[PDB]
Design an enzyme around this catalytic site. Structure first.
Site, mmCIF file in Angstrom:
data_model
loop_
_atom_site.group_PDB
_atom_site.id
_atom_site.type_symbol
_atom_site.label_atom_id
_atom_site.label_comp_id
_atom_site.label_asym_id
_atom_site.label_seq_id
_atom_site.Cartn_x
_atom_site.Cartn_y
_atom_site.Cartn_z
ATOM 1 N N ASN A 81 29.092 20.986 -8.746
ATOM 2 C CA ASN A 81 28.846 21.078 -10.184
ATOM 3 C C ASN A 81 28.738 22.544 -10.548
ATOM 4 O OD1 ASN A 81 26.709 18.607 -9.201
ATOM 5 N ND2 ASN A 81 28.398 18.076 -10.589
ATOM 6 N N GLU A 90 31.026 24.386 -1.388
ATOM 7 C CA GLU A 90 30.681 24.179 -2.785
ATOM 8 C C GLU A 90 30.837 25.466 -3.607
ATOM 9 O OE1 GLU A 90 30.336 20.603 -1.280
ATOM 10 O OE2 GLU A 90 30.589 21.157 -3.384
#
Ligand SMILES: *[C@@H]1O[C@H](CO)[C@@H](O[C@@H]2O[C@H](CO)[C@@H](O[C@H]3O[C@H](CO[C@@H]4O[C@H](CO)[C@@H](O)[C@H](O)[C@@H]4O)[C@@H](O)[C@H](O)[C@@H]3O)[C@H](O)[C@H]2NC(C)=O)[C@H](O)[C@H]1NC(C)=O
Ligand SMILES: [Zn+2]
Length: 696
Positions: A272, A305
């Site tokens: 995210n 990530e």
């Protein structure tokens, strides 16, 4: 009669900015929301289709200018869509704002906006609210055009008790009292981005922070009990973040990177944008109850990530059919970044292992091409990482670095097809046409090398345990020069001439290419002789490449088991982890078969040989539970191998450690105690030869 019936949303209505208000009650597990989505139509239409899932929509209305008509709401929950019907058709180019008010229950299924729980060290149970929208679960939190190519900007406002803390993609701009015991957090509007990357957490987490040289505020968030375990991840995040800024030649796009250790996290980790979320295992390191083997998994996940914060989030796939590239590259960057930031972790060993595993599955006829059509952790991503690595070594590292930089700069805040990467790569070789061969067709080629003097002949053919044809980006080295040479094999056969004749030539340098190489005539002998004579001539990975290939070819019957076993004999000298593991992975299953058959006197000579081969290495292995994160696995396997096999210095110190543990896993030891058509053929061809071999 629901007015839309494609899985994909109509392309003629485009969101531009969302105003999200989410008020979520963590006591009653309910949230209310209002969504103002600004839009424009590129074509007249009185129907707006968008995504919504398990949301009770109370009222929906369309603003223009300054008017405000209500919209009739139609639900097609099976397609996770809803239709909004406007009294008049929308005018092309004119901005409209859609306002949807809705309610929903926090999900219990760890997807969308979901309830997670944790018991504090002082006994109390506490609740937190968290998101996970990848791939299509933003529609469970707020209605939207939930496809990754409908990028938009998000102003998010979260309402919570003073008890709690809200974090989201962007920094907190202001907190305001909206009611009695209700605070409204106003987060800064995001840069243009995809719905599935939008994140928010309603929690009671404490946190720790560190600034990068660039000035980016990096923070790790954890439950208060385990926040002392976050120090490693934080230091890693900053290093990697700094690394990626340099590599991509693009500053970190957002103003702050938060990492969160979500308690009952059911994915592994998600990228995210600005608010990465991880399972506690994958981010926190317990000084006591977790091994230094955990640190690899943390660094590598962060690496992955964080990589997405540019590759995936700054430049996003147009559609899920190119998810393989996104993840392939993240995985590939794990290897590239960590090998530079945390060299002591030795990521190289892990990477090629997975490439081999990818190949083992890719050789099976059941295999699928990496790039499939999609109309709705995995080996396809691994393969994608390998072919990406193959590409990088063929072009320079620097060339490949330029291609990525240009690509990222060119398509920033937009979306792309995988061909767009190849196009960027091909302008810093028809990279597009090449990579298409590796992404559109399953499996990988056997490269057969035939040398006549200076004329090095190359044949390619699909390897199978079809008429397939690749653009193979071959690299090689010769006895003469350690310099890496390149040759692009676009056809079924080709030739290249060397300046002078060579004792040996070795294709697939550093094991970097996704393919296997066979050598006709005395070529294997040349390479067998090279290893026996001077093995450091080629790299550890090259040696591993040779052993894997050698024995793999013995399986498909293009090489006699003796020739492979003769090569194996070099392992006497072998020190490094990658080749020995290859030796073991191919030699061990041979005797494991021979046990099942009752010609078990050759069994004994084989095991004698295997143990005599590795004897020297078995010694030098000192008895700690601590070393190079994979080197440990070598120790573990070698020591275990030496006994059951009844090596005498195994059972000299090995049981002296057991009597020391007598003074004050467990299935394994308590079982290894002395109280089919593939096989039938293998042993049918291979038994006698192996015996005739062993004898000598
Ligand atoms: C989730 O839903 C819950 C109910 O289902 C909510 O809870 C209740 O929340 C309220 C306040 O948020 C709380 O009541 C408080 O009442 C006091 C309010 O303070 C004022 O002080 C002055 C007193 O002289 C006056 O101005 C006025 O009379 C008023 O009383 C406050 O001081 C008290 O400490 C008290 O907490 C209830 O206790 C909560 N109920 C329960 C069962 O816990 C919860 O807030 C919701 N959360 C969200 C985000 O929606
Ligand atoms: Zn990823």
């Amino acid at each position: 009669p629901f007015p839309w019936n494609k899985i994909r949303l109509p392309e003629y209505v485009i969101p531009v900015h969302y105003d999200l208000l989410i008020h979520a009650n963590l006591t009653t597990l309910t949230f209310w929301g209002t969504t103002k989505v600004e839009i424009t139509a590129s074509q007249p239409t009185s129907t707006i289709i968008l995504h919504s899932h398990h949301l009770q929509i109370s009222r929906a209305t369309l603003r223009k200018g300054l008017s405000e008509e209500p919209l009739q709401v139609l639900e097609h929950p099976r397609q996770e869509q809803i239709a909004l019907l406007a009294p008049e058709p929308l005018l092309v180019g004119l901005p409209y704002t859609v306002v949807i008010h809705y309610a929903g229950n926090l999900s219990e299924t760890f997807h969308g906006f979901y309830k997670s729980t944790y018991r504090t060290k002082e006994g109390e149970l506490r609740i937190l609210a968290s998101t996970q929208f990848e791939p299509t679960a933003a529609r469970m939190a707020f209605p939207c055009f939930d496809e990754p190519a409908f990028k938009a900007s998000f102003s998010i406002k979260i309402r919570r008790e003073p008890r709690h803390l809200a974090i989201s993609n962007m920094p907190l701009v202001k907190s305001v009292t909206v009611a009695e015991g209700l605070i409204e957090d106003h987060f800064d509007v995001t840069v243009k981005m995809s719905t599935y990357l939008v994140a928010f957490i309603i929690s009671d987490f404490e946190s720790v922070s560190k600034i990068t040289k660039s000035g980016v505020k990096v923070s790790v968030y954890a439950v208060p009990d385990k926040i002392n375990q976050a120090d490693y991840a934080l230091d890693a995040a900053v290093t990697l973040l700094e690394f990626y800024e340099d590599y991509f030649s693009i500053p970190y796009p957002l103003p702050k990177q938060d990492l969160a250790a979500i308690p009952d996290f059911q994915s592994g980790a998600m990228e995210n944008w600005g608010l990465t979320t991880y399972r506690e295992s994958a981010l926190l390191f317990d000084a006591e109850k977790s091994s230094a083997s955990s640190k690899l998994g943390i660094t590598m996940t962060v690496a992955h990530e964080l990589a997405h914060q540019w590759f995936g989030n700054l430049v996003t796939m147009e559609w899920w059919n190119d998810l393989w590239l996104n993840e392939g590259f993240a995985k590939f960057m794990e290897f590239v970044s960590v090998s530079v930031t945390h060299p002591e972790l030795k990521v190289g060993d892990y990477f090629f292992g997975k490439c081999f595993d990818a190949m083992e599955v890719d050789a099976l006829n059941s295999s699928h091409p990496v790039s499939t059509p999609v109309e709705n952790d995995d080996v396809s991503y691994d393969k994608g990482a390998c072919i990406l690595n193959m590409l990088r070594e063929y072009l320079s590292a620097d060339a490949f670095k330029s291609g990525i930089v240009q690509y990222l700069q060119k398509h920033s805040y937009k979306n792309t097809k995988n061909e767009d990467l190849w196009d960027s790569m091909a302008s810093i070789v028809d990279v597009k046409t090449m990579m298409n061969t590796w992404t559109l067709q399953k499996g990988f080629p056997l490269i057969t090398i035939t040398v006549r003097g200076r004329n090095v002949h190359m044949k390619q053919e699909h390897y199978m345990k079809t008429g397939y044809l690749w653009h193979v980006p071959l690299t090689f080295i010769t006895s003469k020069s350690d310099m890496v040479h390149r040759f692009l094999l676009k056809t079924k056969t080709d030739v290249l001439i060397l300046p002078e004749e060579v004792e040996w030539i070795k294709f697939n340098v550093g094991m970097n290419g996704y393919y296997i190489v066979h050598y006709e005539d005395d070529g294997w002998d040349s390479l067998t002789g090279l290893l026996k004579g001077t093995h450091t001539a080629v790299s550890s990975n090259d040696r591993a490449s040779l052993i894997n290939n050698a024995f793999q070819l013995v399986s498909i019957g293009k090489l006699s088991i003796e020739k492979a076993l003769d090569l194996s004999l070099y392992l006497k000298h072998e020190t490094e982890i990658m080749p020995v593991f290859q030796g073991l992975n191919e030699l061990i299953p041979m005797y494991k078969l021979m046990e099942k058959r009752d010609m078990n006197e050759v069994e004994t000579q084989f095991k004698a040989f295997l143990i005599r081969l590795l004897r020297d290495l078995i010694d030098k292995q000192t008895w700690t539970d601590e070393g190079s994160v994979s080197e440990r696995m070598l120790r573990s396997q070698l020591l275990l191998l030496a006994c059951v096999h009844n090596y005498q210095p195994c059972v000299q110190r090995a049981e002296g450690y057991f009597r020391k543990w007598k003074e004050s896993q467990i299935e394994f030891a308590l079982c290894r105690t002395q109280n089919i058509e593939e096989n039938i053929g293998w042993m049918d061809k291979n038994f006698d030869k192996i015996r005739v071999w062993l004898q000598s």
